[PDB]
Structure 1
Amino acid sequence: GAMAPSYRVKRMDIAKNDEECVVNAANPRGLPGDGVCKAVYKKWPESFKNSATPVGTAKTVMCGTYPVIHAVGPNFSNYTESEGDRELAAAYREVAKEVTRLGVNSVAIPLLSTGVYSGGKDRLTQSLNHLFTAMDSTDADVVIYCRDKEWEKKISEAIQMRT
């Protein structure tokens, strides 16, 4: 575990993280995809061997000894708000189980379902609150990765608010 488990946010490519493992915002078919998933494919292509997994689940594949946790958030284009919210919560619960099983002291994590799976809606608060619900009981240092300057400020404020 980390000595004083923390949350932090950084505005940079998650493929350049400084943590002991990475969460990929994956598609269910294990395809290279785009956004986070394509950066993750370029950096850790060996981790896409048998990475296909259903919506609401996470599947870990090693790249060398570096764990890539493929977490499949719902595409809100296809899911109802209600079912999508349930599957987004579930994907983060499965990430917490994997992070725990792996025994890592730190994890790099993107906000699931906030990009091309957002169904055109701002889901910063929805996705971050599900991330907190899952990860609060883990003792890994969590480093959240984003690309937008205004998102960085809002994520930082939400972390600081809980103290």
Structure 2
Amino acid sequence: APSYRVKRMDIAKNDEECVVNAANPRGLPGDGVCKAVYKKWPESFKNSATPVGTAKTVMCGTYPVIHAVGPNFSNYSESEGDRELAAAYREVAKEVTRLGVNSVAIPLLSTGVYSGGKDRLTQSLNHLFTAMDSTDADVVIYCRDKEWEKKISEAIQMRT
């Protein structure tokens, strides 16, 4: 039965059948999760540009990298950002289904440099749940912060 799990570690060392990059719409290497991903899978950045609110898969050998572009909340209104954040996750679910993978390593989109300085753990995680609930893949969420690890775990546990 497919599960949700959380791991506090570098997403570039995931043990899943594909990864989601928290990407920018320019397809450029960038900072944080995107930097790790670039160093691990540089060939997945060939023609990886995709607009805000979308996701695009680029293969690195046979390993799929799903570049998903959450909104930068600095730029977006709360209502328009929320729409785009939801859309990005929906496109992730679609790519995951099309690939036929049994598992996916995913970050919380729009929670770091794109958070607009707000805590958006709950907002982002709930959009992730809504989209990925219709898939049969194991989902592993990767975070860096110990407190976030606990709150994500609690949110996972409380739906069971």
**TM-score (norm. length: structure 1):** 0.98
Alpha-carbon shift at residue 10 of structure 1 (Å): 0.2
Q: Look up the SS of the partner of 1:23 in the other structure.
A: strand
Q: Does 1:147 align with 2:144?
A: yes
Q: Deviations over 1:8-53 (max 9, x none)?
A: 0000000000000000000000101000001000000000000001
Query: Per-residue deviation at 1:101?
Result: 0.1
Q: CA deviation at 1:94?
A: 0.2
CA distance in 1, matches of 2:99, 2:89: 15
Structure 1 counterpart of 2:132: 135
1:9 equivalenced with 2:6 (yes/no): yes
* Residue 107 of structure 1, CA deviation: 0.2
Structure 1 residue 79, shift from structure 2 partner: 0.2
| Aligned alpha-carbon RMSD (Å) | 0.3
SS in structure 1 of the partner of residue 89 of structure 2:
helix
Q: Which residue of 2 aligns with 1:88?
A: 85
Q: CA deviation at 1:147?
A: 0.1
Q: C-alpha displacement at 1:112, in angstroms?
A: 0.1
Distance in 1 (CA, whole Å) between partners of 2:103 and 2:50 is 23
Q: Provide the secondary structure at the position in 1 that maps to 2:114.
A: coil
Q: Secondary structure at the match of 1:90?
A: helix
5+ residue gaps, structure 1:
none
Q: Which runs of 5+ in 2 are unaligned?
A: none
- CA deviations 1:73-120 (Å, max 9, x no partner) are 000000000000000000000000000000000000000000000000
Sequence identity percentage: 99
In structure 2, C-alpha distance between the alignment counterparts of 1:104 and 1:52, rounded to whole Å = 22
Question: How many angstroms apart in 1 are the aligned matches of 2:94 and 2:138?
Answer: 15
Cα deviation for residue 162 of structure 1 reads 0.4
